PDB file of N, CA and C and ligand atoms in Angstrom:
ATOM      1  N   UNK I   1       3.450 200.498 -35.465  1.00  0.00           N
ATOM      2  CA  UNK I   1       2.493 200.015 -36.472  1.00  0.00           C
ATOM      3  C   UNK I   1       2.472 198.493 -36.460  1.00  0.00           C
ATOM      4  N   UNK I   2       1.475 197.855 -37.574  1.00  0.00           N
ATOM      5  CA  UNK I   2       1.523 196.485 -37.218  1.00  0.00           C
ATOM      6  C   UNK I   2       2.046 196.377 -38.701  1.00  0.00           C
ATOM      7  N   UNK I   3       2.005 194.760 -38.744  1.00  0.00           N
ATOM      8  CA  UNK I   3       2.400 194.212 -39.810  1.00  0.00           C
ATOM      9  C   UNK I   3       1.511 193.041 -40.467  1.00  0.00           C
ATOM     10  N   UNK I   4      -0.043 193.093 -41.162  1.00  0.00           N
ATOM     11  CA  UNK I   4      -0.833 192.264 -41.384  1.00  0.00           C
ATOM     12  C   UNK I   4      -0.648 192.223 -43.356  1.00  0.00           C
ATOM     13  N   UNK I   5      -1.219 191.693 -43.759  1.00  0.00           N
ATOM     14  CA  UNK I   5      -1.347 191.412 -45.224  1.00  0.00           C
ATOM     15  C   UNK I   5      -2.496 191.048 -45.240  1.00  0.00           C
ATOM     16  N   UNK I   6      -3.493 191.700 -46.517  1.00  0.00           N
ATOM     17  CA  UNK I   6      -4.564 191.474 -47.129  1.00  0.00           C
ATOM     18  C   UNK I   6      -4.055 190.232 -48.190  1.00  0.00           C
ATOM     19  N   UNK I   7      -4.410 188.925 -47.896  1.00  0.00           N
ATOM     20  CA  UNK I   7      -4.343 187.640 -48.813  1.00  0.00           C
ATOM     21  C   UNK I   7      -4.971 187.524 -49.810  1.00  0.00           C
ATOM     22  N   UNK I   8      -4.088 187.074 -51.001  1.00  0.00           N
ATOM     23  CA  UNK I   8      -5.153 187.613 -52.176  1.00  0.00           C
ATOM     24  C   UNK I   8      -6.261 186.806 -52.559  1.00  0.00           C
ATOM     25  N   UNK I   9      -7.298 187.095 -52.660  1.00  0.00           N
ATOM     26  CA  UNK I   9      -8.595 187.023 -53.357  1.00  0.00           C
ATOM     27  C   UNK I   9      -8.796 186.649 -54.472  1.00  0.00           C
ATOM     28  N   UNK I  10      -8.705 187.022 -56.063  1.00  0.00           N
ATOM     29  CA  UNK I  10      -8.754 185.976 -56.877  1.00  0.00           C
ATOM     30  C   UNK I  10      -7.989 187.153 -58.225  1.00  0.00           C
ATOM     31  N   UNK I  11      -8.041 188.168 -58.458  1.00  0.00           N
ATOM     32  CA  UNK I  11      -7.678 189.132 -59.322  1.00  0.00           C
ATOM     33  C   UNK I  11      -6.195 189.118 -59.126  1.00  0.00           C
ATOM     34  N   UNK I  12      -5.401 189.279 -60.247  1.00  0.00           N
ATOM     35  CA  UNK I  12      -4.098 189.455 -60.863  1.00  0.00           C
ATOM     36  C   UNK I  12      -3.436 190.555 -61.330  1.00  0.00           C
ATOM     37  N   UNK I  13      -4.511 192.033 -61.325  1.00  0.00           N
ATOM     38  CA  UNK I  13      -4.120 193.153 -62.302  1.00  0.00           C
ATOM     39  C   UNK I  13      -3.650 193.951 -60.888  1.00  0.00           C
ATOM     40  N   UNK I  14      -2.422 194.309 -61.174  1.00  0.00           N
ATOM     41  CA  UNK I  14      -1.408 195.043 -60.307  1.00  0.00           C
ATOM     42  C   UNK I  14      -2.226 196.606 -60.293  1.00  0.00           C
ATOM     43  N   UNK I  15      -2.913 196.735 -61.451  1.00  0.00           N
ATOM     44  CA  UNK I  15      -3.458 198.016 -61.879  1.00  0.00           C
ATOM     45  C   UNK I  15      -4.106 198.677 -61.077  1.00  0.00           C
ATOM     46  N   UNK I  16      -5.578 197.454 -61.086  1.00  0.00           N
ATOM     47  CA  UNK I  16      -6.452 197.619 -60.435  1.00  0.00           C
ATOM     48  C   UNK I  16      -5.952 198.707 -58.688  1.00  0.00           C
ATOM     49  N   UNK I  17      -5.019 197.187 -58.406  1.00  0.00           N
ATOM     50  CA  UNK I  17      -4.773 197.416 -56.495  1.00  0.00           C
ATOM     51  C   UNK I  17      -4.247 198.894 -56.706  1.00  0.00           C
ATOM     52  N   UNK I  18      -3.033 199.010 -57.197  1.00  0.00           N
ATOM     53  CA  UNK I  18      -1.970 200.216 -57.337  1.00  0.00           C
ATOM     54  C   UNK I  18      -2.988 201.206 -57.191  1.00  0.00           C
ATOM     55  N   UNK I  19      -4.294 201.119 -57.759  1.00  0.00           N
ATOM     56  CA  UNK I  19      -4.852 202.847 -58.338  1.00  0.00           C
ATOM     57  C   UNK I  19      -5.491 203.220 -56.935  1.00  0.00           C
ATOM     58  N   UNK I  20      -5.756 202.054 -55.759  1.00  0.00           N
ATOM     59  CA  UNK I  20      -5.959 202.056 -54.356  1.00  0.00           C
ATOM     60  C   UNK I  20      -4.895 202.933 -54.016  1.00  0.00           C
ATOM     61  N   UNK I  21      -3.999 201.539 -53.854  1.00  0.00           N
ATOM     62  CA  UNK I  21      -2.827 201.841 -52.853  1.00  0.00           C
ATOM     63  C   UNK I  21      -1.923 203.463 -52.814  1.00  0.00           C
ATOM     64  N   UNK I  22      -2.294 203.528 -53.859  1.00  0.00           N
ATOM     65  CA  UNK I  22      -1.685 205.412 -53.597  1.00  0.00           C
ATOM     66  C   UNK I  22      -2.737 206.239 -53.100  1.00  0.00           C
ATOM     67  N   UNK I  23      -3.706 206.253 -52.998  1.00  0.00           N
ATOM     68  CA  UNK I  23      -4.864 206.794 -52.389  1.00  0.00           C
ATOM     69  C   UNK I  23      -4.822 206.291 -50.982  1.00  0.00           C
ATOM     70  N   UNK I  24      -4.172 204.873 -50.639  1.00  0.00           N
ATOM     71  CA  UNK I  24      -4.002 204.395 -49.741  1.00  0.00           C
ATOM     72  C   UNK I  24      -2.971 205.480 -48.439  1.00  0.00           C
ATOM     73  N   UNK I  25      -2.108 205.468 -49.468  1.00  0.00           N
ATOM     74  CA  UNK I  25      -0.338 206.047 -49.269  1.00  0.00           C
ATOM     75  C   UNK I  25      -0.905 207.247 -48.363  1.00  0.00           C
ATOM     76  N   UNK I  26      -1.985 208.172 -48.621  1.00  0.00           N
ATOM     77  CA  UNK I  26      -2.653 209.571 -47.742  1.00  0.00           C
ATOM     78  C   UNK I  26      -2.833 208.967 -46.177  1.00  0.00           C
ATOM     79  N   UNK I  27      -3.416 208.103 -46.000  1.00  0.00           N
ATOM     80  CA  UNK I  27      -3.400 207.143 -44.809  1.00  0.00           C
ATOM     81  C   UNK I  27      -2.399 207.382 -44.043  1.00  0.00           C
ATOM     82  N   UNK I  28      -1.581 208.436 -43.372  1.00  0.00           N
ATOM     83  CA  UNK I  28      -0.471 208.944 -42.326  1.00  0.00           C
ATOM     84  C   UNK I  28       0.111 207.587 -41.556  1.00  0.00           C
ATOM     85  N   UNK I  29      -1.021 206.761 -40.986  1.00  0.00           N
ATOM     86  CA  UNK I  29      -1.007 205.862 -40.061  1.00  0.00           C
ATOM     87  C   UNK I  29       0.112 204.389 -40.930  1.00  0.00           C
ATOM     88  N   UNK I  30      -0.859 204.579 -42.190  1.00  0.00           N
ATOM     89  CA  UNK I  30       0.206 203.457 -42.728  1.00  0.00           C
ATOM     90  C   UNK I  30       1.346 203.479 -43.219  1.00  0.00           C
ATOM     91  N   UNK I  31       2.540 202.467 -42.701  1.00  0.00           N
ATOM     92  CA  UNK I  31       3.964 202.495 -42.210  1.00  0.00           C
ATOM     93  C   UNK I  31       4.444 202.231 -43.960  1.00  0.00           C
ATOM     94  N   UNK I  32       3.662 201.297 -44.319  1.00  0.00           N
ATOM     95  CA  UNK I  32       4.095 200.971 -45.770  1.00  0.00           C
ATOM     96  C   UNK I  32       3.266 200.001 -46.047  1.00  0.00           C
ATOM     97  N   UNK I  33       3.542 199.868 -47.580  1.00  0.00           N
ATOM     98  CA  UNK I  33       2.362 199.117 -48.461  1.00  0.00           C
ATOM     99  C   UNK I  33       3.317 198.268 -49.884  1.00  0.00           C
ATOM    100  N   UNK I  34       3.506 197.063 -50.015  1.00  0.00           N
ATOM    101  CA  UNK I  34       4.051 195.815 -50.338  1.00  0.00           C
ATOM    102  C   UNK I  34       2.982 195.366 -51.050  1.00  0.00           C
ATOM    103  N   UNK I  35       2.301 195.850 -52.456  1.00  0.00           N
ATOM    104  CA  UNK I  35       1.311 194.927 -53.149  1.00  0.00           C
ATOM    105  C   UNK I  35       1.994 193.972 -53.560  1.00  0.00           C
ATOM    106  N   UNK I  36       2.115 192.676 -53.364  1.00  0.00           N
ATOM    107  CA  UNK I  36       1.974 191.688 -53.909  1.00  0.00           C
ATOM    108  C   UNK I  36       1.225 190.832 -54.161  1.00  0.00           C
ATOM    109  N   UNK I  37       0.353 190.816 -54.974  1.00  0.00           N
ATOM    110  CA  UNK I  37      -1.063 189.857 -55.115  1.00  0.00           C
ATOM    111  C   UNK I  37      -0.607 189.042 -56.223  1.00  0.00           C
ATOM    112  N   UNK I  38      -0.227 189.130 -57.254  1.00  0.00           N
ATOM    113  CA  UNK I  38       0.711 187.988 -58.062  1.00  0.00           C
ATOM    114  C   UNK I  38       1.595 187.086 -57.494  1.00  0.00           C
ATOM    115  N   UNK I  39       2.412 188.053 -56.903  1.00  0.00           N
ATOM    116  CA  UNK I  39       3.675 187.088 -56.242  1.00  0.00           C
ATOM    117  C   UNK I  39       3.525 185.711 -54.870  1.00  0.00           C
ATOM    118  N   UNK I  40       2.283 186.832 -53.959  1.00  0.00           N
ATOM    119  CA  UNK I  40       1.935 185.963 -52.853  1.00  0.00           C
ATOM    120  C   UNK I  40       0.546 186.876 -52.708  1.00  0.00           C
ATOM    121  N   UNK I  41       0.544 188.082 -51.972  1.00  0.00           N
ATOM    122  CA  UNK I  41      -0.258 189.295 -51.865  1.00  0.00           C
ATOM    123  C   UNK I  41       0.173 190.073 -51.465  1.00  0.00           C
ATOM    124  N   UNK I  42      -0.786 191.303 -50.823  1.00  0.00           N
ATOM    125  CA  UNK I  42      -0.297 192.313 -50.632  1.00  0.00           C
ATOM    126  C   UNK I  42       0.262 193.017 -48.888  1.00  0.00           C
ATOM    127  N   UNK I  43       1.383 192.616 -48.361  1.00  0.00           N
ATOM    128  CA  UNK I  43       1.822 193.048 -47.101  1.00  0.00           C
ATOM    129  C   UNK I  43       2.177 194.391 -46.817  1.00  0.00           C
ATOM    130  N   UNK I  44       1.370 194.493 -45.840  1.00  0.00           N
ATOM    131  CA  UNK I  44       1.078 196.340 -45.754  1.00  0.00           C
ATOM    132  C   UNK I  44       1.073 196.666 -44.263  1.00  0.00           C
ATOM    133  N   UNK I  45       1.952 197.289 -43.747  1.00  0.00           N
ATOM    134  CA  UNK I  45       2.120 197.585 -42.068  1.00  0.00           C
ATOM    135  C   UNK I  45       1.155 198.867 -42.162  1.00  0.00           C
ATOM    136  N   UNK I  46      -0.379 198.334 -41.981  1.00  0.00           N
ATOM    137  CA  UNK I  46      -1.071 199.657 -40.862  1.00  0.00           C
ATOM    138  C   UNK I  46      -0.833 199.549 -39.722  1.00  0.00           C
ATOM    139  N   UNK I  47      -0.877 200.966 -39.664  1.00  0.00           N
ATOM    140  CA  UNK I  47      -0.695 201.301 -37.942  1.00  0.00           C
ATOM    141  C   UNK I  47      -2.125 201.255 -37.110  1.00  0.00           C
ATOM    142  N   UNK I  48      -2.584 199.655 -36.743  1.00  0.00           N
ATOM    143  CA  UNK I  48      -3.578 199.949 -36.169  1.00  0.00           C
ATOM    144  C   UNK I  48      -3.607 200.473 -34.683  1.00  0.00           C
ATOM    145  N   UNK I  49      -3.123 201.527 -34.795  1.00  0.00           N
ATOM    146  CA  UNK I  49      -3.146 202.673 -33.774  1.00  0.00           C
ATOM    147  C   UNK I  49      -3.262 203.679 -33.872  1.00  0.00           C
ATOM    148  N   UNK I  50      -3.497 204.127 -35.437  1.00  0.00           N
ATOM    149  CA  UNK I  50      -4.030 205.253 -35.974  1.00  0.00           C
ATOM    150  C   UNK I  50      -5.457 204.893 -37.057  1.00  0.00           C
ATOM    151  N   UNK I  51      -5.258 203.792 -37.588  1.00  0.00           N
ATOM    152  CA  UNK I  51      -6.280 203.331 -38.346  1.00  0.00           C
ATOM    153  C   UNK I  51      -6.066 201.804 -38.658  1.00  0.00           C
ATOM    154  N   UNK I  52      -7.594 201.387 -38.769  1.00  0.00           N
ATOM    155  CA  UNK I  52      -7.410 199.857 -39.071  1.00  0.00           C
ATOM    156  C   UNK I  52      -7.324 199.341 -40.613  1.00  0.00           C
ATOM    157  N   UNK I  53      -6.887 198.081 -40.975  1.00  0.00           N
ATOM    158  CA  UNK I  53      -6.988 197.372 -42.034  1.00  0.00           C
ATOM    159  C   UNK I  53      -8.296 198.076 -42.247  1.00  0.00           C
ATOM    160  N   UNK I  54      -9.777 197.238 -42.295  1.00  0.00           N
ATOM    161  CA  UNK I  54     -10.918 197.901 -42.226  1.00  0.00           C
ATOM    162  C   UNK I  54     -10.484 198.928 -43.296  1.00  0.00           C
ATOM    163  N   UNK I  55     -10.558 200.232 -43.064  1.00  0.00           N
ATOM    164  CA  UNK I  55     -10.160 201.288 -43.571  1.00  0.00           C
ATOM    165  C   UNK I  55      -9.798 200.681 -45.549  1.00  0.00           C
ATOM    166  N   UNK I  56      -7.915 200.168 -45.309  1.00  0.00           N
ATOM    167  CA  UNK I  56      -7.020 200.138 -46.375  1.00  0.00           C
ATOM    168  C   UNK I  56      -8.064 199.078 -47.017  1.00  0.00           C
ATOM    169  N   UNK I  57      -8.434 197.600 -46.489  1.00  0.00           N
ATOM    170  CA  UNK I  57      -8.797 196.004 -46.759  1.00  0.00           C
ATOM    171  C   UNK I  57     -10.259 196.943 -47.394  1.00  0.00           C
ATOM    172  N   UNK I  58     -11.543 197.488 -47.332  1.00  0.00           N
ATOM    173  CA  UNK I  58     -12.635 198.006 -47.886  1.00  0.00           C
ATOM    174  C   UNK I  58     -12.007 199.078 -48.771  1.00  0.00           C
ATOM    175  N   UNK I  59     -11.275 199.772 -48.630  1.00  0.00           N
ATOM    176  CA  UNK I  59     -10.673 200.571 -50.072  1.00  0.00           C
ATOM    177  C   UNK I  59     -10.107 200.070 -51.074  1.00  0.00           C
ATOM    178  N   UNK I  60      -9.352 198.764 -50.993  1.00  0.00           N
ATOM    179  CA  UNK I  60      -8.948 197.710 -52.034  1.00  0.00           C
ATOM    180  C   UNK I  60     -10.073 197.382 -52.726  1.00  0.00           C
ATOM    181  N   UNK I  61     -10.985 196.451 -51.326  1.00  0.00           N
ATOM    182  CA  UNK I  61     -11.872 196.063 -52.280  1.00  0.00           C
ATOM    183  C   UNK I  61     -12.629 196.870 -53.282  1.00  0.00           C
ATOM    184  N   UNK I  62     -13.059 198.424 -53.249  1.00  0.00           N
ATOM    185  CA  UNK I  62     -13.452 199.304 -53.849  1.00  0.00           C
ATOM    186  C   UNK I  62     -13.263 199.011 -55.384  1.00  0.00           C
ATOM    187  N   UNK I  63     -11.792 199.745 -55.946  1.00  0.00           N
ATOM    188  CA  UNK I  63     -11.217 199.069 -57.383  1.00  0.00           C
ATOM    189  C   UNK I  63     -10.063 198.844 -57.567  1.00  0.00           C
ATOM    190  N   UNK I  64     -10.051 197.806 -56.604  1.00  0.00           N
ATOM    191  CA  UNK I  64      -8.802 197.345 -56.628  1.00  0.00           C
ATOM    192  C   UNK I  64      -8.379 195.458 -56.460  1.00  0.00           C
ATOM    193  N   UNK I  65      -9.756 195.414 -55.846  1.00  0.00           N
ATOM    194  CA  UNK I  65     -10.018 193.478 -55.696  1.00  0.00           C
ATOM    195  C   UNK I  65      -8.816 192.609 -55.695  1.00  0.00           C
ATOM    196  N   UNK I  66      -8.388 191.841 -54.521  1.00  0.00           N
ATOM    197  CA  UNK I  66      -7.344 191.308 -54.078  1.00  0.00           C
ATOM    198  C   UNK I  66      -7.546 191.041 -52.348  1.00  0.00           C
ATOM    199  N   UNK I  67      -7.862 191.797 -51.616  1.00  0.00           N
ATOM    200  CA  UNK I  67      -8.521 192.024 -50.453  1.00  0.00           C
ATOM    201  C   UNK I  67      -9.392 190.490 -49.983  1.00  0.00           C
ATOM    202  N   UNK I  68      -8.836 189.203 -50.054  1.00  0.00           N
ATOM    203  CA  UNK I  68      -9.666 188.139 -49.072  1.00  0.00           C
ATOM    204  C   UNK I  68      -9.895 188.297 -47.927  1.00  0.00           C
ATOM    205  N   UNK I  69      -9.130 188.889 -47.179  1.00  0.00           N
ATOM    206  CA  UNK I  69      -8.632 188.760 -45.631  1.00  0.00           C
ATOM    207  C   UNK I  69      -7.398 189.210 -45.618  1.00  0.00           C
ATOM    208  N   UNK I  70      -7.455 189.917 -44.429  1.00  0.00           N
ATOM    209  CA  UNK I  70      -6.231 190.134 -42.905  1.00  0.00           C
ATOM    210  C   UNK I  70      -5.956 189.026 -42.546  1.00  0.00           C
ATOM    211  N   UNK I  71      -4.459 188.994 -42.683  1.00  0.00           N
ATOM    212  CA  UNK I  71      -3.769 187.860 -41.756  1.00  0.00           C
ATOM    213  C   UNK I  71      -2.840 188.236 -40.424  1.00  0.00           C
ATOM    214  N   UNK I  72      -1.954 188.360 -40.896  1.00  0.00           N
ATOM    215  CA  UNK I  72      -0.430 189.014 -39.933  1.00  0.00           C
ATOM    216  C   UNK I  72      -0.984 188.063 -38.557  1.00  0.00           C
ATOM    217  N   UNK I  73      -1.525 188.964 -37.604  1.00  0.00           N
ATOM    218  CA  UNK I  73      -1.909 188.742 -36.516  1.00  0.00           C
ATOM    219  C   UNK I  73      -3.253 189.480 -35.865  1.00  0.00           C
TER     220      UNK I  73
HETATM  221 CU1  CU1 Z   1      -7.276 196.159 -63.631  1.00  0.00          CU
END
């Protein structure tokens, strides 16, 4: 798997992302998921070899807003 982070965007509510990120968690491919958007953001190893950011980074944005950009590599 890889190791990229969605950089946060401008929202603060842990709420919001969380109600993603377990919907996220069904995602097989992804290794693990590190919301931190308060602290720094949110670092999340997809396996883009089963599925891309794309995928997790447009489901954040959905209702969860934090999602600026992919970094890692
Ligand atoms: Cu919220």
């Amino acid at each position: 798997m890889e190791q990229k982070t969605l950089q946060v965007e401008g929202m603060s509510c842990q709420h919001c992302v969380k109600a993603v990120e377990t919907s996220v968690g069904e995602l097989d491919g992804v290794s693990a998921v590190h919301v931190n958007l308060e602290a720094g953001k949110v670092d999340v190893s997809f396996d883009a070899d089963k599925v891309s950011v794309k995928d997790i980074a447009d489901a954040i944005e959905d209702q969860g807003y934090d999602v600026a950009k992919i970094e890692g590599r």
